[PDB]
């Protein structure tokens, strides 16, 4: 139990409410006080003009942590025999010996702890937990560069086999000891000390002793060994529960539930931190991308307007038949970085060098398409500009543009959105504080350069194009063709569920090892569903196939979802795009790797083993070749 | 918090003699997380 | 207590309120359990150098539909009863307490219920528009067959019994 | 809350202010013996089923009649009473308007020990002229009694400097009373002797003195405002039997009686509402020796204290009390149950909370002692 200790507040052993219990402190327990403590470690000082005198609390110690500062103290005595060379801390902490043993009520709030009356329970202040910790703590400071050298000592020469024993005389792997330590390692100072410290952390190393003449084994952590050690026909357990717990805690992060749901999720449950994408959006086609707009081709009246930023600056620049701009409505906050670095924009009647290309925000209740004469422009101001820089190019008689980072961030909150009529547009171009000849400048625009957009939110996800409040996972399987893949945003569903099921591929990969066309825990799933279905009544001609090519394509099927995950998306996919192949082994995995019982598959044993015994081979080699180039007397 | 009144009280959130002194000994948890494994329950 | 038509009622001696033991709140709730959605009545008396708690109330066979829905026991709050401070004198048990005859608009509601009562059959998924907050339609589907109540106003029934 | 079966409320209310006290005065006593219409020193009791005078409360004087009831032969109906009362009251007040005439002793401080022994030996027929010379105090009303000596024995009787004095009746029946079920409780106060009371000026002598006196019966003492200064209270063997089926003596009706008072003041508080007392109930000192915990007394103690800190009944009390009520109210004393108020009864002293809202520590100067940690 934990929590705090009560005691009665004087009544007669008659405590029948909550109202008559109060916090014990130091004072009703006067061996818990400051003064009271053994200070075998001499951290309370002797003077008793320093020793305060004042009411701490009490608080319950727990079982948990008993154990667990128990075996932070033998931490500490794993290098008892340098902590003796310095002169610190002569005497061990003994931590049971901080704790007062008192029969009192046991609880958090008292209305618990009224009907909770326990015996026996160990009580302890904050102050001599704290300086218990301290004290530990000190210990530790202490022998940063002693561990340091003993590990280097340990991981110079190979001191640990996968398997079997290995080999080599003693005074061999001294002189080599000698020959490559470093001199500034105190094992050259202090060698005794660091022989019984290697004796005690490795079984392997024994010492003679002269006296006497008895050699044995003497390290203190054979049961660690024997649950790390393993056995001829079986990897190691400790290994395998490692592995099983990891794909779990993979599982559970991928939130089977939420991706495979028929019903609507919320937008910011079902988002994740996305990633930037990079677009060209003069070579993209408008009716894939649903998100751009483009006046009519073939008109034969360019036009020209003005426009002023926010230092109220004029600038010139002309629309033309075929530009481009971008919807700014309806696509959740995002910015923009445009570079044009490797283009040229080169004719003889004009050269980009020492011009400036900016982006320009238009808002107007008239469709893009329907614009001529500047008449139609409406509000509009000059957001950012940078200036360009011509350098030679590999085609010979020809220059390219140097690099830019032109950028943007559109936040949708700071626009009005007064009146659904009105529409936003944003297009990038040249500008100049001279007015541009229609027949000097004929590139429409300047889209023809690399574009990243990457979000500005994380509660925000759109479907091709456009934002939406809520997605039904399981609405979203065999319903993108690659086309639409490539021109969607970078907030887009697709993405999210692609990346949340990349988890259950890893998960599924780390557990499974199956070979080309072999059955698994983790196909048949998809097998109870096909052959279920192939005995249904739809329409169009009907399929029988046997439990083996069933088998095999539910094999086949499993293989082509861990190698490329983004197969459930992809329309047309071959088997799955259907929605209950999916469902199904999202809901089979959790299922499979629940009831594993310590287990793994034969191929993994039968190689790691041989892969251990190589090893060992390997290592006795080089044992050999250590016994040999530093003989012994 | 906000300002009160009653005719006995104990504390007094808007008082004197309160103490607010954050510390590194002192910290603040209340219950992050448990071991539930299947494993280790059964 | 073995017809499905009939009376129900139960006597406390000497009220425990303030920290009412299971027993009694436990023995409360089940006999709101047997009578829910009806009609209930209350005295505090003097018998027999004792005070005592009396609670009143009918049962029928929409009480029992409703019961055979439940799971587990929802338990009251006893607070409205631990305010009374004050004597009710009692009355006679009688079935038919109206003494008048219903009014059609009664009549009329009825009929509505009869006729949501019929049409739904055994196990089929409801969807209920414009519910009160007592879910009156908890008495008239079966006992098996799910319900979704959608209303403005917040409801008062219990949700994990 | 719940207290062996006594429901109790959610809510603590306790009185505020005391009121005053005035002396008394021979134009007051000559006043008082005039018995006018409206402010006679007696007020009958009804039965509250047939609405009959069933019994009558003596205010002062008339708080001294000790004796067997047919030594003063009185009458049997109200009226014959009253009508016996009032001619013999006349008379005493013209033999004391004899001695101290009222044109230059109108304002003088009078000895309510003389005035209610005088009345008793008059209405007893036995000599009191030595009662006289007594009336109008002198020094102080107990210096004056302790140091006549044996000669007025048969009413004060001094041990030393201790004064003891035999309690009189409160309450007195009439003929029609039948210890029915809707007759009003006496509480056993209409016998002959109940209870002995022993004055003196301060408690330490009073505790000096009852160390090498019996005291098993049970010690009684009120701390707020004493009626005749400070004084215990013994209890005698006499017993209460018109609350069947129970039997109760003398200690736990008085006891009894006091709580109830306490409980009724406690419901019926103003803020500026001037009471009598600010504490009716009685503490038992000495004695507590030989209490049970099954017992009636230590549950009535425990009521007793409840009430002092400012508890209510959750049932109503009936503005006159009737002895149904009572053996209900007792019934469910004794039943089955734990105190769960986290107050229990001592003998050194009186507990207040400290979230109680008595005021009665600060009115006083020795008796009741606040508790920080209680709450």
Same mark, same amino acid.
């Given at each position: 139990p934990g929590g705090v200790p009560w005691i009665a507040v004087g009544d007669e052993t008659s405590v029948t409410s909550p109202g008559a219990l109060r916090r014990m402190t130091s004072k009703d327990i006067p061996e818990t006080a400051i003064i009271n403590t053994d200070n075998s470690s001499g951290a309370v000082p002797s003077e008793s003009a320093l020793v305060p005198y004042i009411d701490e609390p009490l608080v319950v110690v727990t079982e948990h942590a008993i154990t667990n500062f128990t075996k932070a103290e033998m931490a500490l005595e794993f290098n008892r025999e340098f902590l003796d060379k310095m002169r610190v801390l002569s005497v061990s902490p003994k931590y049971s010996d901080l704790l007062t043993y008192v029969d009192c009520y046991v609880?958090?709030?008292?209305?618990?702890?009224?009907?909770?009356?326990?015996?026996?329970?160990?009580?302890?202040?904050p102050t001599r937990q704290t300086m218990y910790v301290d004290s530990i703590q000190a210990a530790l400071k202490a022998l940063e560069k002693w561990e340091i050298d003993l590990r280097v000592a340990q991981t110079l020469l190979p001191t640990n086999v996968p398997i079997g024993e290995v080999s080599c005389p003693m005074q061999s792997v001294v002189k080599l000891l000698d020959d490559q330590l470093p001199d500034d390692s105190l094992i050259r100072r202090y060698p005794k000390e660091a022989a019984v410290a290697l004796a005690k952390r490795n079984g392997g190393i024994q010492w003679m002793d002269?006296?006497?003449?008895?050699?044995?084994?003497?390290?203190?952590?054979?049961?660690?060994?024997?649950?790390?050690?393993?056995?001829?026909?079986?990897?190691?357990?400790?290994?395998?529960?490692?592995?099983?717990?990891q794909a779990m805690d993979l599982v559970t992060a991928a939130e089977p539930e939420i991706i495979a749901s028929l019903a609507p999720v919320p937008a910011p449950v079902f988002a994740i931190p996305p990633k930037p994408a990079d677009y060209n959006v003069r070579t993209l086609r408008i009716d894939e991308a649903t998100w751009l707009r483009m006046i009519p081709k073939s008109m034969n009246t360019p036009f020209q307007i003005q426009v002023t930023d926010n230092t109220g600056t004029n600038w010139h620049l002309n629309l033309r038949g075929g530009t481009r701009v971008v919807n700014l409505d309806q696509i959740a906050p995002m910015r923009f970085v445009l570079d044009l670095g490797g283009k040229s924009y080169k004719e003889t009647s004009w050269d980009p060098n020492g011009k400036k290309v900016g982006f320009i925000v238009f808002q107007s209740k008239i469709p893009f398409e329907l614009w001529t004469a500047a008449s139609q422009i409406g509000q509009a101001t000059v957001v950012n500009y940078v200036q360009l820089y011509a350098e030679d190019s590999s085609f010979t008689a020809q220059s390219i543009i140097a690099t830019t980072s032109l950028a943007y961030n559109y936040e949708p909150e700071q626009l009005n959105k007064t009146d659904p009529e009105m529409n936003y547009y944003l297009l990038a171009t040249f500008i100049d504080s001279a007015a541009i000849t229609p027949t000097n400048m004929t590139q429409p625009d300047v889209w023809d350069a690399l574009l990243t957009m990457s979000p500005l939110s994380a509660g925000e996800v759109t479907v091709k194009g456009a934002v939406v409040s809520e997605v039904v996972p399981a609405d979203l399987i065999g319903s993108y063709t690659p086309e639409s893949l490539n021109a969607s945003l970078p907030n887009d569903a697709a993405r999210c569920m692609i990346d949340r099921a990349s988890k259950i591929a890893e998960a599924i990969k780390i557990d499974d090892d199956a070979g080309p066309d072999e059955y698994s825990p983790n196909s048949v799933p998809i097998q109870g569903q096909l052959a279920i279905s192939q005995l249904e009544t739809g329409y169009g001609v009907r399929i029988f196939n046997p439990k083996g090519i069933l088998s095999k394509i539910a094999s086949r099927a499993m293989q082509a979802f861990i190698g490329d995950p983004s197969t459930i998306i992809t329309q047309a996919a071959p088997v799955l795009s259907d929605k209950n192949n999916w469902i199904a082994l999202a809901q089979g995995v959790k299922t499979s790797l629940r009831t594993k019982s310590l287990s793994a598959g034969v191929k993994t044993a039968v190689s790691k083993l041989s892969s251990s015994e190589s090893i060992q081979n390997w290592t006795q080699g080089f044992l050999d070749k250590v016994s040999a180039h530093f003989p012994a007397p | 918090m906000g300002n009160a009144s009653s005719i006995v009280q104990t504390i007094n959130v808007t008082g004197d003699g309160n103490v607010f002194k954050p510390s590194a000994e002192t910290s603040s948890t209340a219950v992050p997380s448990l071991s539930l494994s299947p494993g280790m329950l059964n | 207590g073995s017809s499905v038509t009939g009376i129900e009622?139960?006597?406390? %001696?000497?009220?425990?309120?303030?920290?009412?033991?299971?027993?009694?709140?436990?023995?409360?709730?089940?006999?709101?359990?047997?009578?829910?959605?009806?009609?209930?009545?209350?005295?505090?008396? %003097?018998?027999?150098?004792a005070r005592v708690l009396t609670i009143t109330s009918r049962r029928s066979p929409a009480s029992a539909r409703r019961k055979s829905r439940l799971r587990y026991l929802p338990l009251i709050d006893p607070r409205s009863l631990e305010v009374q401070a004050r004597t009710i004198l009692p009355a006679d048990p009688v079935l038919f307490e109206n003494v008048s005859g219903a009014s059609p608009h009664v009549c009329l509601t009825m009929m509505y219920n009869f006729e949501v009562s019929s049409a739904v059959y055994d196990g089929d998924v409801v969807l209920d528009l414009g519910t009160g907050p007592e879910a009156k339609i908890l008495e008239l589907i079966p006992a098996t067959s799910p319900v979704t109540c959608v209303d403005i106003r917040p409801t008062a029934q219990p949700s994990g019994c | 809350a719940n207290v062996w079966g006594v429901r109790l409320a959610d809510s603590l209310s306790s009185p505020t202010i005391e009121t005053r006290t005035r002396q008394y005065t021979l134009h007051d006593l000559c006043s008082d013996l005039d018995a006018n219409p409206g402010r006679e020193p007696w007020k009958p009791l009804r039965n509250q089923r047939t609405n009959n005078i069933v019994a009558v409360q003596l205010f002062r004087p008339l708080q001294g009649l000790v004796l067997d009831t047919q030594l003063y032969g009185?009458?049997?109906?109200?009226?014959?009473?009253?009508?016996?009362?009032?001619?013999?009251?006349?008379?005493?007040?013209?033999?004391?308007?004899?001695?101290?005439?009222?044109?230059?002793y109108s304002n003088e401080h009078v000895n309510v020990f003389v005035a209610n022994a005088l009345v008793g030996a008059f209405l007893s027929n036995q000599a009191f002229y030595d009662l006289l010379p007594l009336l109008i105090i002198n020094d102080t009303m107990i210096g004056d009694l302790l140091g006549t000596g044996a000669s007025l024995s048969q009413f004060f009787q001094s041990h030393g400097d201790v004064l003891e004095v035999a309690a009189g009746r409160k309450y007195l029946q009439?003929?029609?009373?039948?210890?029915?079920?809707?007759?009003?409780?006496?509480?056993a106060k209409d016998l002959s002797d109940y209870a002995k009371a022993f004055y003196s000026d301060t408690y330490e002598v009073l505790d000096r003195f009852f160390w090498t006196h019996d005291s098993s019966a049970g010690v009684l003492v009120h701390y707020d405002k004493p009626t005749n200064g400070h004084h215990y209270l013994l209890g005698t063997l006499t017993q209460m039997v018109s609350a069947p089926p129970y039997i109760i003596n003398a200690t736990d009706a008085m006891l009894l009686e006091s709580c109830l008072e306490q409980f009724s003041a406690n419901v019926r508080a103003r803020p500026a509402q001037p009471v009598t007392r600010l504490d009716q109930c009685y503490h038992l000192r000495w004695g507590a020796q030989y209490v049970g915990e099954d017992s009636l007394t230590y549950r009535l103690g425990v009521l007793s204290l409840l009430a002092t800190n400012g508890y209510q009944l959750a049932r109503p009390i009936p503005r006159q009390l009737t002895n149904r009520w009572l053996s209900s109210f007792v019934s469910q004393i004794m039943s089955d149950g734990v105190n769960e108020t986290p107050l229990w009864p001592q003998e050194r002293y009186v507990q207040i909370a400290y979230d109680s809202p008595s005021v009665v520590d600060g009115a006083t100067q020795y008796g009741y002692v606040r508790k920080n940690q209680l709450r």
């Open positions: 609880g958090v709030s008292a209305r618990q702890a009224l009907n909770n009356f326990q015996k026996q329970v160990p009580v302890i202040t002269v006296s006497e003449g008895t050699v044995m084994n003497e390290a203190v952590n054979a049961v660690a060994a024997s649950a790390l050690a393993p056995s001829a026909s079986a990897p190691p357990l400790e290994e395998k529960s490692k592995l099983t717990e | - | 009622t139960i006597s406390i %001696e000497n009220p425990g309120f303030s920290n009412m033991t299971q027993a009694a709140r436990i023995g409360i709730s089940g006999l709101c359990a047997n009578v829910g959605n009806a009609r209930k009545s209350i005295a505090i008396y %003097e018998s027999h150098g | 009185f009458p049997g109906a109200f009226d014959d009473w009253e009508r016996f009362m009032r001619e013999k009251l006349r008379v005493l007040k013209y033999e004391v308007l004899r001695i101290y005439p009222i044109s230059n009439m003929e029609n009373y039948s210890n029915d079920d809707d007759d009003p409780p006496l509480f």
